[PDB]
Structure formats: C-alpha cells, structure tokens
Amino acid sequence: AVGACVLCNSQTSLRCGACIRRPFLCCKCCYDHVISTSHKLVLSVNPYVCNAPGCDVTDVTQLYLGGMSYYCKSHKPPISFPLCANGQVFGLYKNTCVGSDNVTDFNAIATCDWTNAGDYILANTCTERLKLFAAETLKATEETFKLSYGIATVREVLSDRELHLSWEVGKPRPPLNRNYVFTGYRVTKNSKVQIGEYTFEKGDYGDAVVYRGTTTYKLNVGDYFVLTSHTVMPLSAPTLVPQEHYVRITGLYPTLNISDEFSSNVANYQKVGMQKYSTLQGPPGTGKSHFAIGLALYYPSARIVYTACSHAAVDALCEKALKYLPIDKCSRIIPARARVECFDKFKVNSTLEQYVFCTVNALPETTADIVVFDEISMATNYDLSVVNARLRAKHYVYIGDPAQLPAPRTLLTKGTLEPEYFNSVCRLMKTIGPDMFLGTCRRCPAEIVDTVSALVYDNKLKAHKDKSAQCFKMFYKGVITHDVSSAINRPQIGVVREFLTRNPAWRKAVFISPYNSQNAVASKILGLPTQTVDSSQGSEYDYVIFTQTTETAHSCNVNRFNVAITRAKVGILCIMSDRDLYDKLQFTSL
Amino acid sequence: AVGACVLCNSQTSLRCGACIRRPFLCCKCCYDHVISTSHKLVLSVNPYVCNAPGCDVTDVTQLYLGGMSYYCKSHKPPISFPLCANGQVFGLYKNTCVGSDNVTDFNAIATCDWTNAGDYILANTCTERLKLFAAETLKATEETFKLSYGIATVREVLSDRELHLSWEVGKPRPPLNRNYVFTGYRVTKNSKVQIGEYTFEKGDYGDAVVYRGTTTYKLNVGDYFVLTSHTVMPLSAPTLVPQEHYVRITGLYPTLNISDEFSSNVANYQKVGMQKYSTLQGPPGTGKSHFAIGLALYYPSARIVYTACSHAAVDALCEKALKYLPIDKCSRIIPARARVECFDKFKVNSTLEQYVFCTVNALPETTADIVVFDEISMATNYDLSVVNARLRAKHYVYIGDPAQLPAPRTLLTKGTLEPEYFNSVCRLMKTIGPDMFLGTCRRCPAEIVDTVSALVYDNKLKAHKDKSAQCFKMFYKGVITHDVSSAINRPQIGVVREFLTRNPAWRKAVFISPYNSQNAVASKILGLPTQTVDSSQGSEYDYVIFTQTTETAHSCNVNRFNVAITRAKVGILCIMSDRDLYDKLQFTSL
Amino acid sequence: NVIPTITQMNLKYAISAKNRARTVAGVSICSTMTNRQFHQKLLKSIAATRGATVVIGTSKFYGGWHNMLKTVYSDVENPHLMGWDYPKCDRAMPNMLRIMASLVLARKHTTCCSLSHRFYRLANECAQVLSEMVMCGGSLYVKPGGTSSGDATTAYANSVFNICQAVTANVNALLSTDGNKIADKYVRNLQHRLYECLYRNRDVDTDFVNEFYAYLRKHFSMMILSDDAVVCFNSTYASQGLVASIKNFKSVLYYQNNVFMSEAKCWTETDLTKGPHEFCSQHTMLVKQGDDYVYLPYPDPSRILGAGCFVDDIVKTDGTLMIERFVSLAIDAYPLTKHPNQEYADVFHLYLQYIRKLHDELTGHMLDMYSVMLTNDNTSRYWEPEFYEAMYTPHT
Amino acid sequence: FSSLPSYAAFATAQEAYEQAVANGDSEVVLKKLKKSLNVAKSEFDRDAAMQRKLEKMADQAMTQMYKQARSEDKRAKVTSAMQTMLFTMLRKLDNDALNNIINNARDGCVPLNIIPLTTAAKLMVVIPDYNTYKNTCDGTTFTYASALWEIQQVVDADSKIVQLSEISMDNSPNLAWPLIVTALRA
RNA sequence: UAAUAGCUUCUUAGGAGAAUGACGUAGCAUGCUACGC
RNA sequence: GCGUAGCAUGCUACGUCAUUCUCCUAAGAAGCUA
C-alpha cells in the first residue's frame, strides 16, 4: 500500500515498522528517521528482513538487496547493493520525495514514552499532520498500557445493588467512576466467553463495590474481571477546520419570537452564526448549557448536533433541551452496547432527526447545519479530529471553560500540564481569547465570586445575590495517615465534627475531597452524601463540605480549587492547609 | 490522429498541449514553436509525459524516447534517444515536414490573450490558414473567459415573479440582460443535477431580478445557477469559398418581367449570377436588404437561405419577405431555447422549405442555390466559417456595410478596430471594393441625413424628404448612476418623461440608448418600446427618442450615434452629453 | 465442501459454414482455478505424449501428421479407415458418461487424495460443470446435463467419452455376433470370456481386461482428438462382426446417447494411400517430399479464402497492418500446392502474391510517412515458398 | 561509473602518461606508466559492467515491487466491490417469506430452486408468441407457482411499453415478440 | 459480453550456454642479449 | 653452469568488448483446430 509521508506529504511506500502506529515515510524522510533514532526496521510492500533459509536481520542500515530479496552481508550475492544509501531508503517513488527537516521534532514525537510533561506540550504545537500523528500514537500507547493490568472477581453474591471485590495480589487497581468500565470472563470450565460489562466503585467499608450493570445475566464466582480494551483506528480530519468568515449568516435563518428569556445573547447568537467555528468560554455557572438552547431557538429550523466527551454533560444538555426546546423533534443517539445507564426520555436514536444529541465516541457519519461541541476541556485532540471527520456542518461552536478540570490524561505523572495545552481549542482560547465570554455568576457569595474572578479570570464575573454569610475557610492541621494508595484526613473530620454542631444548616451536606480515599472514609462514620471533585462540575448544591488533606502542587492547583469552591451556593465548611490557600480569598475566621 | 500542420499543411502527428485549441503541428514547425515560446507540452498519439512509475516531466527538450516509451532524463532506459533535437521534434512523418517562417506571427497569435487591439489587426491580415486558426483560438478564449465568472444562488422569494439574487463572495458578477443564460444545481445531498435553463434581468427597486425560465421549477433556497459553457468546434470550412468567375449564369434562371419595382437592380442580379460570391456594400437604407428579396423574385426557382448574426435583423428581413415573397413558401428557424421572441407568422421550423430564414448560430446543415448573408458587420469570422460549413450553396451573396456598428468584441478594451478588420468580408469590401454598390437616403428626413452626412460620411449623401422640423437636440446634464455595470441616467429619463406628455404625437417613439441597463429600466417610467443601439440597426421606426446616457468612449462613438439617429423615419428627439456631439449636428432649439 | 457455480453462455463470433449460432460456456474462476489444480498434471502429461491413442499436444507440422497416421496404422491386418460423428455431442452426452470420464481422469489420485477427497472433487465437478446454474441473458436457468465446453478438462474428458463409446461399440459387436459362425477359435473363447467378465463376474479380471485391450489395439487401432476419431480397423473381422463397424456405432449412440448418427456424416476409406477422409477438418494427401512419400494435411480452400476475405475486426481489413495474419494463413494453405486440382494449388500462390503486394504498399506508405526506408527488412522470406515448405519437413 | 574514484585513477594515470610521453620520458618509465594506466583502466572497467547489472536489477526489483503492491491496491477495490454486492443482495431479500420457509425446513436447509418460487415478490414471464400469452397469463391476473399474480407491466423485446389491449390475435404481427410481462405477487 | 485446451508464426526484453575474433593482466614453457658469481 | 633484467614466440587461467548461434523464461500481436 502506498500513501503520503507524514512530514512532507509526498507519495511513498515505506513505513517505520518499529513505531506503534507504523506511519508512512518518504525516502529522504525515512532515511532521516532511521539514521537518527533507534528505529531500524522499515516496512515496504514486503518487510525488510533477511530472506535467507537461516538468518534474522531487521536493521535496514545493514541490509543489502540482491537478486529479488534482501540479505545481510553474510548472505548477499556477488552483486551489490545497499538498500539505505545516497541519503534515501530504497522504495517506491524515489524521485518525487521531497525531504523536510521538521524531523528534528518527529524524532521526539515518535520516540517519546509520554511519561514526562513536555511530550504533550510539543505534541500539540507541531504542525497539523504531526498534530494528528502524535494524538494517534498517544492513544495507541494508552491502549497498550491498559493491556498490562490487575484482575479481580466477585467474592460471593453479596447484594442486588452491590457486589464485592477479590483482586489479585501484586498489581495496582484503577480509579472507579463511569469512565473506567470492567469486563467479566466466563472461563468456568468450559469456554471463556462474555456475559456483560460492569463498572465498579468503592464500597462503604472494608472491601465492597457499589456498581453499575450492563447485563442481567447474574454470574456465580465463575467469572473474573479484567479491564477491557480495543484497537485505535487511524484519524484523518484536521483538529480544527480553517477559520473562514462569512459576511451575512448563511444557511441559518433567524426566528420569530425567540423568547424574552435569552434575548441579550442575540448579538452572540449571530456571532456564532457568522464565522465557521466559534469559541465560547463561560466561567462556571454562566449559561453555556443554556446558551446552546438559546442558539437552537435563534435559528429554529436548523438541525443541530450537540456533542460532548462524556455522558454526564450531554445528558444534562439533553434535559435542558427537553425543558426548553420542542420535544418531539429530538433524538439522543445511544451506544448499541450501552456501557452507561443511558438516557431514554426522548424519541431515542433516530439519526435522521433535527436536534440530534450524541457523545463523541458514538457519533455516526452524518451532516448537520451547526454542531455544538460541549466541554472542550474534557475533549482530547482525538475527539476533535473525530468530530471533524464524522460530522460535516456549516458551523461549529465549541463551548466550555479551560479553567475547569482537564481530561483524565492517565499517562502523565511528572510535572503539571498547564491549561493552555489541554487541546487545540483550549490553546486557541488562551492564545487570542474566546470569541464569546459571558461573565456573571448566579451561585456564589460576594467575596468568593469577586476573588475567583480575581483569582485566575481577567476580572469578568459577578453575583446577582448577596453573600449568604455561611461560607468559611479554616486552617486546622488535620493529621495525615495516608496508609493507602491515596491520602486520608480523618481527624480533620474530627475537627469539622467539633464544628457542625453549632452550625445546624449543612446537616444534609455533600462531602467532597481532593482524594478518593478520604472521600470514601467520609461516607462511613457519618452518612454524608458524597460527590467527588471530578463528579462535580455540572451540578449545583446548597450544602457541601470540603476538606484539604495535604499540601503540594496537587493542593494548589487553582483549576481544582475553582471547580471545588463553586459548587456550593449558600454554605461550605472547608479546610485549608497552606497559608497560600487561606490568603487568596476572603472569608470569616472562626 | 494523423493530421495536417496548421501553418504549412504538411503531414504530422503532433499537437501542442498548452494551446487551447490543440493544433496539429509538423516536426519543424513544432520545434520552432516550442523552443521559442513558453509552451512545452506536445501530444503525439501518446502524450509526451515521462513514463516512470511516478514522474511528471513535460518539457520536450528534457525527454527521450527510451525503450518503448517517453522517459525523462534520469528515468530513461539506458539506451536513449533525444526527442526534441536536430532542429526537429520527433513525431510521425518526420522526414517530410517542411514549413515556413510564419513562425513569427504564429507565436504572437498563440501567445496573445486578445486583450490589446493589435492582436486583432494581426489576426486578420495574416495568411489564410492563420486567419482560421486565429478565429478558432479567439472563440476558444472567449469561451474560456466564462470560466472565471461567479455562480449564483437564491436569497428567498417574497414575490414569485421577481427572484432574489445572491452572488458568490469573491468572484465577479455577470451583467443581467437577455444575452446570458444560466443553468442550475441543487447540490445539498440530494441532486447535484441541473434544474432548468433560466435567465435574469434587474429590478428597479431594492435588490431583485424579474427572472424567466424554460420550465416552471421553484428554487428551494439551496438551488442555484451557473452560466453555461460552450465547446468550440474546429473551424472546418474556409472563411470565404474561393471565387470563380463564370462566363455565363450557371445554376440560376431569370424571370419574365420580375416587377416594376425591382427593375433597376437587374444588372447586379446578373453579376451575382456570374460570380461565385458577391458583396453588396451600401449606406443604410439604400436598398440592400430589399435587394435580396428582389433577387429572390428574379431567380424564382432558386432555393434561398437567408441568414444574419442578429435576431432583430432577420426578423425585419422576414417581415419584408412576407410583404413581397409568396408567404406559403417561407420558413423561420429558431433555436431550442429561443431566448428572444422570434417571428411566428410563417410555418416555423421547416428547413426543407424554398425560402428559409435563420440566424447563423442556429443554421442547420443543408444545401441551397444561393445563400444570402446579411449584415456582415455583426458577423465575425466564426459566423462566416459556420455559414460556409453548414450551408452548401452554388452562389453566395454577402450584403452589409462596414460603417454600421460591428460585432460586440467584449474582450477588446484598448484602441479602436477599423472597419477593414471586422471580418474577412468587410476586409474584402474595403480593400478592393464591393462588387455591387448602391447609395442615397430614402427613409430618414432631410435634417437628420443632412447632419449624418457630416458625422460619418464626408458630405456624400444627398437624400429625399423635407425636414419636418421634428428633429430635436436637447441640453440636459444627465447625472450618472452606474448601477448594473451599465450606466443608468435617471434624470435624463426624467427629462423624457416630463416632456413625453407634452408631445401628443410622440407617444409611440422607440426609446434608444447605448446602455442596455437604462434602456431596459425605462420600460416602467414611460412604457415605450425600448431598444438598444446594437440591435436597433437594420430596423426603422416612425419616431425615435435617443438618450446619450453617459459621456464615455462607448456612447460618444460616432458610428454608434450615426446608426442610432438614422433609424428615424419622420422625426427624432435626442438628448446629448458631449458638448461637441450636440454641436456637430444641426437640430432645433429647445 | 461443494461449491456450486454459475456458468455464463457466451455467443461465439467466428467464421463458420452453417448459420446456427455457436455458444461457449464461461465457467467461473472459482471452478477453473481448482479444476486446474486438480487435473493439470495429468492433462499436461497427456499433451506431452507422442504415439498414444489420444493425439492431444501433437503438432501437425514438421511431419507430425505423418507420424500420427503411421501410428494409427499400427500393424493392422486388413486395414480400412473409418470415421464417425457425434450429433449434438456436448449437449446430448449422458450424465453417466460424463461422470465416467471424470472418474477415469481421477484414477491418477490414488496417493494424493483420499476416498472422500475424490468424491468431493467429483461432486464439485458435477455441481460446476455437469448440472449447474447457467446465466443466459441475465437469467439463471438449470442445465439438465451434458458437458459444458468451458471447464478445464473439456477436450480430455471428451476424449475419454469418445474412447468409451468406441469400446462399447466393439463389445456390442463382439457379443451380438452368433458364436457358432465364428471360425477363429481364439475369438470364440474371447467372446465367451467377455460375456463372463460382463455378466457373470463382479470383480475386475485384469488378465482379461489386458487381453481385450490387446485385441482392440491389434484390430481396432484408434486416433482420438476429443470428438474426432480415425480408426484403422481390420476389415475382415469387421465384416465377420468381430470388430465394431459404423452400424455398431449407430446402435450404441441410439441406445446410449439418445441421438441418431446418420451414415452420411461417417466415412470409410478402403485405400490407405489416400489417408483419412477428414480429421480435425483437414483432408490428407500422400506427397513425394524430398525422396520419400509423406502424408500432408490440407484444409478446405473455401475456409482459407473466407478467412482472408472476412474478418472479425475493422482493423484486420487494412492488410498492411496484418501481414502476419496472411503469413499464418499461407502456412496453413501451403499443402494445397501439391493438390492435383490447380484451383486448389492457386490459393497458396494467391496468398503469397498478396503478401508481396502488402509489403510493397506497406513500404510505399512507410516511405511516404517519412523519407527513409527501413534499414532491416526480413519480409522477403514470406513470399518464398521455402519458408512454408520447411514447415512440413520432419527436421524439427 | 564517473562517481566512483576508479575513473579518477584512470584519468590521472592517463594524464601522467600523456604528459611524460610529451616530455620525452625514457622507455622504462614509459613502460611503467603504460602498465599503471593498463591496471587503472582494468579496475575502471571491472567496477563498471557492475553498474549495468546494478541498474538492471534495480529496475527489475522496482517493477516487481510495483506489481506486487498496484496489485495490492487493486485487491482492496475488488474486496470492497464484492462486499457491497453481497450486502445489497442481503438488503434485497424478502425477509419474512424467507424466514417462514426456512423455519418450516426440518434441518434448516431448503433447495435453492424454491427460494424464488416461494418468496420472490415479482415474476417476469417471457413469452415468444401470442398463443403462449393466451395460455399462460391472459387477463390482468393469472396463476403460477400456486400463487396469484397481478400484471403490473408488459414490455416488448425493444423494452417499449405494451398495453394489454394491444396484445391481440390480429395485433400480434405488429408486436416485437418476445413480450416480457412483469407481475407482482398478490 | 467474450470459455477450456493444443499447435504455429512474428516482435521485444532478461538470463544461461556455446562458437569465433579483439584487448588487457597473471601463471608456465622456449630462444636471444646485458651484468654479477 | 647459475642468479637478476630485457625482447621475441607459444600454452593455460581471469576480466572486458564485438559478431553469430542455441536454449530458458517473461511480455505483446496474430492464425488455425476441437
């Protein structure tokens, strides 16, 4: 098979076989990749190995072709010649191949292992045809990384809403939420096959799982749970289609009596309809979930494809569009496997309807008039290229706040990925600025909202309320035990229970923590309804309690701090460890 | 295929790829053309590209004929030999190709873009084969200029009688008149197929076009239009069939007392019979287009095909024939679309009738006994070749005058074209002289002819009427509105409207102005029959109102103004702009 | 596994002496590929054997016709030549005889194939060749039976069928004779043991099969090309009924082919110096070549003239483009020069003179299209009769 | 050839030989330089012929590689074409009738020849003359395969539409037989 | 739309072999000459 | 008589080139036969 070189797009028929993705490489580019790095295996229309009865040489700098094969020096004929010479590696289209140096970064893209921080930061500022390749090889690396994993089963039948967990000894265990799903294996005597996928979550105390189910087929101990995995297909569409402006709005025809509800965004609705792709960053709780409904009511007859990275955001958007938009011309596209407790309220799963809501992973190849991508902070470059490949539409609108939490990004372990390089769209939003940005905030008290607009934001936020005089911030040591994979702060709950008796308000509070172990133990001794810092960001509460366990760069991440303190509305007790975290904000002392 | 070189008529098998018309060229002539100009692509029976796995070399001095195909410098089989060398280019009939220098005029003809004026004066004074090749490439360039136009679309439809227009952003907009047609698309998903043949014209108010269609399809907003192309056929037949002088009339027969009205042109009828083709040149309204009908009455058995380049001229000829010839044996041949409204009083579209009237473009392949081409000023060499190809004949008669207005020549924008280069027939008329010549004025009054014998003709015409004093020359500034890319003079039209209710005998005067935009838009404000100067030629009216729209080189053209005024029969009012032009004529006061 | 297969019916665009349309069977590649892989070793082994009964792969040039005719006359006692016809051969062939031919061809797989392997190969042959789906004008019909002329083993299975019918005719001829009238005591015992081995024996008697094969080779020598057959039988035995005659072939084809073989298409030649009347559409004549007399095949002069006059393409009409076309036809028409009829001998000279005229006008046109003659021209040997005389001389 | 320094050695040896011959060097030196030039030219031609073999086998290898690949990009095209044909034929199936007749089968196996005959929704009757037409499908409805069919169209051999009133005993000579009648299962 | 198989003619390319001729180098055999013993 | 050097003649081995022939394969055009 022939194709296009990755870094010069000339015709070629080589491939770097040692790479995870096996990218096409033109002659001069292939020589520059093999003489520099440690990849010495090149695949042409036939692999470049030693075709002897007995010999196995893979290196291409040490292969000489002869007759109709390739041998090393011990097995070559009286005739020559080097496969890799004159600056080129012998392949198809030998004289249409233009070299391109930008191999000095293609080496660092192809040879890195993504463990350090800088690999992402230089896998995102490179050119487009390398923006795609870096994303592809990153996904391949993650998929192969999920092939080295721990394995459990269910101890015994324990509850109808909860199972238990019997893991193997000597291997790590994953995080537990709707993102990480798990598979049962039925190797019983007798023919390992699948019965259904269960997602797992930590139990009350000791060892337990409170889960989410896929299939009703109830196993005995005869099944054991693995992670589950899949192939990564190659991506072709660019991350962002080129920005072309339009004079007057095209293919979008404004409405009659939109509403008196969101008529202050009419300028922003038309600025959405003007360009090819628009970018709207709205501070937490400023109406972007409501702006999508307003945009759909400003161009009433345009089919709109709403999309998002995860089921939570798209389901909240679905509920809002049921509450505001017309209901019968709605279509939520569900996965066939149904890995989640999906949303069945609409007339579900008809891809030839008008308001089509879907997740990025489950988008079917179709067309639209304007597609609204939501939560671009969550989305990786793979999701952006996927949504540009599967969906062609007259307009694209990316909405989301980079100040919220990023994607999981599991491989990253050393250093902090700053927001700017979350993906291409967040880089756009920080380089030149979001095209639209709505700054008020309808949840938080006065001091916190002014100071959060003064924390990181360029001072654009305000509150239409008065401060509830029930937000606090303490500095109690909260001695650490941490004798588990995450850090815990129990005697901090001791100090908070030394309060909370003179404060009868938050007696239905939701507990949050920067650590899942302390969150898990906080739901044990007192039945506080818990919702971790990640599981927030999309809901509002009026009673929430948040404690700090440690002091580190994971304790001062102002994205996490901003996503934390903005889920309460009238009352929050909170524990600050570092004097940095008691002084960027104004609250009472106690 | 095997063909004949254009400039030497030797045998050849080569063609020039870069040339629009792809003309055959012998070996010597092809070498002379390619080694000196920028054309470097030569098509033999197989094209001369390099036959590597993938290689793109077209320059002929780079190539070799190696092995069994054409290969470039470093792809050739080790056995050569050079293609473009030894003063020749290797092709079939290699050692029989002998040409001539005219490889200095052919370079200019092939290279020139037909923008200047000298390209036409070199395309009409060259040798006879180049007179055909230059006309062919000129028609090809005129066709390929339409490829640079902007394709439309529909905004909406409030009124179904007046379409709304929307041009593509970033391309020029074609003028809106009868000459240009359009054909649509519906490219949404869902039928990238034509939707009919439409045509446009502007509206006075706002933005609107009061369209017309060949069918009655509506445009759902995605449907749109593109101006249609036209491949140009080889200029197969010579521009003028070579003349032979017979001793006596062959193929034609006289008549018994032809009439008492045509008794003067008998000698010219006999001269027409003697020669193969004849040319009749006369000042307008002297008996030219009536001479042809007299010829028909003099050769009653002879089947005759009348033709002209315009429609409104052949319609006038049709009316005259109805007045004189027996109406039973006539016809009228109309094109399939029939953009203009043609003459429907004869048995329309029956080619095999004795007297058949048609435009040049819609001529059907047939025979005749004498073919009468009329108004050769309107005709270019393409029309002469077309009429000489489709219609075989025994005798040809070309009637027309050079001092009338020539063909449009939209590409020409620098300098002026003298009469003797309008086409081959006008060149013959001005060089050696017409074969038949008749001159005097029998139509226009004494005043207008006594002024036009000062503008264009050097005090040659006496005439016959009495100056009725109904010849008026107006002074009016006439402010400019360059609206449709053809000017509109609203205050001059206002002058006319305010003094057309003061003239009870002028309620039916035809409105003449050089610009089609004002001439078309005048229909609402005064309601008179309207006519442009270019199509008014050849038709007479009892009263004319002429309005010099704007001062330019188009409306202050003495030929155009002279063919404009002399269509009056008893009186004409004209409002003028140029302080000279109003002064060179001698009319009444106002 | 059994793979059923669709075979197309293709109309044949070729020159013929009768106006009935001819159709060939285009069999699928999925059948042709596997049938090649199954049968091609034996099929190439048959085509490479000289001097056998089945003359496939034997050229008629360089003395190949004379060698064939000398092997047919393999020491028969009172030789008469005989040739018969199979009316509607490919469409009236019974399915039992086609299965018989396929099983005879598959006897070579006694070590490479198992019993079930050979059965499923036979079943694939029947499903793809014998009784298949036929595409005839965009419509699928069912073929009732009979061989299709497009399978990999068509000529060879046809040869097996031809030999089977000839052996059956000899068996019927020998058994339907009286037995009290047979004077030769050896043939009477041969008839007795033939009846025993037919209807009183269920196990193969290889000794008698060899004995009857020797009898047939001695008295009924054959030459088979897939439906053409020349026999050089003993005329005295055939008159006494001990060896098959034309009437025995007529009887066998009546009760075993469901056709009537009229004796107007079957010839008998009592004089061996004239050779077979017709074999593979070629007549035979005995000529003095060099110093010895040999058998040369000549075609119908009408066939060669029709091939010259009528073509299946518009560019075969130019002549100068196709001089090899007429060189091949003159190669085929050379033996007509030895015919006693002068109008037959003039066809070869006509072709040679047309080759010379074609080369003359080709060189004229080439010299016109250029101004130089070709440097190397070896076309002069194609209007010399020695190039064609050497085509029938046994040195190669 | 010229790239390799063997040509350089030959050229410098030839230059030295010519210079010393022009300078009138002695016979011994002349023979020495002649021998050196001879061995230099020997090395030159010995390393050359090898270049011919190099380019010949390189072009053969490149042509073989092109043939093995073009043939790999022509295989995917026919694979996709066969897949699309198979799936369109799947979508053509009369699923309910086929499901009924295949569930009635004891082994799940049925003869192919009854698959249209019991499940096809459209019947094409090709009729060579008028007597056959009168026998088999005269009228707007007829019976075949123990089913009832209604005539939806009739065309002639020219694929021109024929009306049922035109198929008569006297209008038979004016019709381009055979007639193909298309009927739908009632 | 264009089957299976056989034979033949012609053309082009590649390899291998043979024969003859030419050049160059190396090895061996012989004749003549120069120097030393 | 021996050793070294040079010239001439002859034989063998190897490398290069020119011509002719045979064969083996591949590709293409065509003809005939069943």
Ligand SMILES: Nc1ncnc2c1ncn2[C@@H]1O[C@H](COP(=O)(O)OP(=O)(O)O)[C@@H](O)[C@H]1O
């Ligand atoms: N025009 C408006 N006037 C008052 N409140 C509004 C208006 N538009 C939106 N809101 C409120 O702002 C809040 C925005 O939260 P949400 O709808 O989740 O979107 P986001 O999370 O993007 O801000 C909503 O609770 C809604 O009630």
Ligand SMILES: Nc1ncnc2c1ncn2[C@@H]1O[C@H](COP(=O)(O)OP(=O)(O)O)[C@@H](O)[C@H]1O
């Ligand atoms: N012999 C004649 N006697 C009287 N009137 C004539 C004669 N010939 C022509 N005319 C008049 O002169 C006019 C000339 O018309 P035409 O030949 O069409 O002029 P042109 O050819 O310049 O358009 C005709 O309208 C006719 O009425």
Ligand SMILES: [Mg+2]
């Ligand atoms: Mg939102």
Ligand SMILES: [Mg+2]
């Ligand atoms: Mg006129």
Ligand SMILES: [Zn+2]
């Ligand atoms: Zn690599």
Ligand SMILES: [Zn+2]
């Ligand atoms: Zn490259």
Ligand SMILES: [Zn+2]
């Ligand atoms: Zn090796």
Ligand SMILES: [Zn+2]
């Ligand atoms: Zn050119």
Ligand SMILES: [Zn+2]
């Ligand atoms: Zn020329």
Ligand SMILES: [Zn+2]
């Ligand atoms: Zn090239």
